[model samples]
Target chain A: PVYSFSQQPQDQVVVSGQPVTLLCAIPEYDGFVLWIKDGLALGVGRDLSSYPQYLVVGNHLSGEHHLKILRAELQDDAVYECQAIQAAIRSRPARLTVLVP
Target chain B: DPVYSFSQQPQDQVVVSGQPVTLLCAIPEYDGFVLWIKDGLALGVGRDLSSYPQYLVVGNHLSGEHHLKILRAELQDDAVYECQAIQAAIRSRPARLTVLVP
Candidate 1:
């Protein structure tokens, strides 16, 4: 089963200057490509700096997919997506929650 | 700087309920402190098994050496068992445990 987090409960709140982790489970994808943020993509290179402030972490073998956003702020409040691309399958979207203190 | 170091052979296997299992842990330089955690819960060191019964620490050496052995590997033994080291106020990369069936 290839699973993605499109929308979660809005009540989720993340405090400022704290750490929050978002989990994305995609079982069907192979171990070749990586999980990326689309809106931050540039012409030829991926612009990680474009995002507010976050760190994504995952392991291909363990299938543990998650994102870590450190030092949350008001400007970091936005809808974030998790995407997985492979040769045969394109996974669905997973949403993140960044709350205010 | 602080370091944690340990090693396990490929054929080092344990038998639980007739199932073969392999136990892995970090060396002394990396064995800052030992923990047997499951599902984000800590199975404390030398604690009574009756009160908080979930896992067991099969072996531990004060020389900074530690090994958690499962007598009879069960279905619940499957998890991201991490052998972590904390030094210089940081946690090292976890050594994962893999359980195999016969």
Candidate 2:
């Protein structure tokens, strides 16, 4: 089924340790969502295990999709987005900046 | 600039010449054809490699796991294999296949 992403993250300059939320919504809930960080698949299968500072808030049930990056570290500063997995889809890119304060 | 990405990619594959090797790729919650790219070359769109000599793609390519196998691995087969998707505009992380000589 064709999916539509309602929320797309934008380029934001955030300080390290600051929580960041990347959202990708869809009107249709059949297809699943994926989170990409710096060209890497960080979130998948409705589970957050790759990183302790990350979480996914959407599936075939939730109309609202969210990818939260908690306690952003130096390495956390990179491009991110919510990826679509059904009927072929993709979200906008969100650039993150980390500060060492 | 696309959100579609690889959910999981097989780690580095190290094998001996004449041995066997398979590159595994998984797409979460999606059922569609997956294309395999080797060293930036498109292998195919599905799990049919009967014509391609020494190469065979098998797995639940539609549901999740799309795997490609190399029969009687050779030294020249030592390269990076990437499972990519055209529908989602996602290029998976390349799985490096290292072949050791006897």
Candidate 3:
């Protein structure tokens, strides 16, 4: 099982109104599938009711699976997992720590 | 001014091990940096390329694609991946990676 992070210091203290990005990377996989936060799953072609705030940003050309948190807040402070289920196997977990200032 | 899309087929559930999986990415315009991030990390960063079995990239003028060929896969390979393009103006939305087990 392998895991990685885009930003250094997994645990950082962020203040409200600041911008934060949690990278859910699986460099070995093919397409960018979905972004899951706190065990909640949101996939492509699914409804947006699950995640209205969290947005999955990436380039199909450049294989980047990144989660962008627009304007941080107390409610957005928590751990998130970037997960993918390809043909039925789940990859290792990527942890994102959101701190408050 | 540009739209990003993927060329890989969508599956509800993917069978683990014994099955060869390939996820494809498609971008119409703009070329900068293409990254395949898994669980928030680079897939082949700081690792021995020789030891790792399969992974490659295939690009074209109309679109770009990342190809991964896993031989004798496992459960731990399951995780979400994002296909991203970074440019001077805007960033495209992430395409989720779902690795399922049968």
Q: How far is candidate 3 from the true structure (C-alpha RMSD, Å)?
A: 11.8
lDDT of 1 by residue, B1-102 (tens): 433244541122334443534345435544233444343333343222232333445444654444555555666665554443322122223334445565
Off by over 4 Å in 1: A1-101, B5-22, B29-32, B39-41, B45-54, B87-102
Q: What is the TM-score of each candidate against the true structure?
A: 0.36, 0.53, 0.39
| lDDT of candidate 3 over B1-102, digit per residue (tens) | 445444452232365655666555555554544444455543431112223455444445354444444445466656565554433122234434445556
Tens-place lDDT digits, model 3, residues A8-89: 2144457777877755445545633445444334434122233566566655334456666777778776655554433122
Query: How displaced is residue B2 in candidate 1, in Å?
Result: 5.4
What range of 10 consecutive residues in model 2 chain B has the weakest lDDT sum? B42-51
The candidate scoring highest on TM-score is: 2
DockQ of each: 0.03, 0.03, 0.05
After aligning candidate 3 to the native by TM-score, how far in Å is the CA of A13 from where it should be? 8.0
In model 2, the Cα lDDT at residue B67 comes to 77
lDDT for residue A59 in candidate 3, whole number 0-100? 53
Top candidate by DockQ? 3
- For each candidate, the alpha-carbon lDDT, in order, equals 0.42, 0.69, 0.47
| Clashing pairs for predicted structure model 2, backbone only | A83-B3
Cα deviation at B40, candidate 3, in Å, is: 1.2
How many clashes in candidate 1?
Answer: 12
Which residue ranges in model 3 land beyond 4 Å of their true spot?
A1-101, B1-12, B44-52, B59-62, B88-102
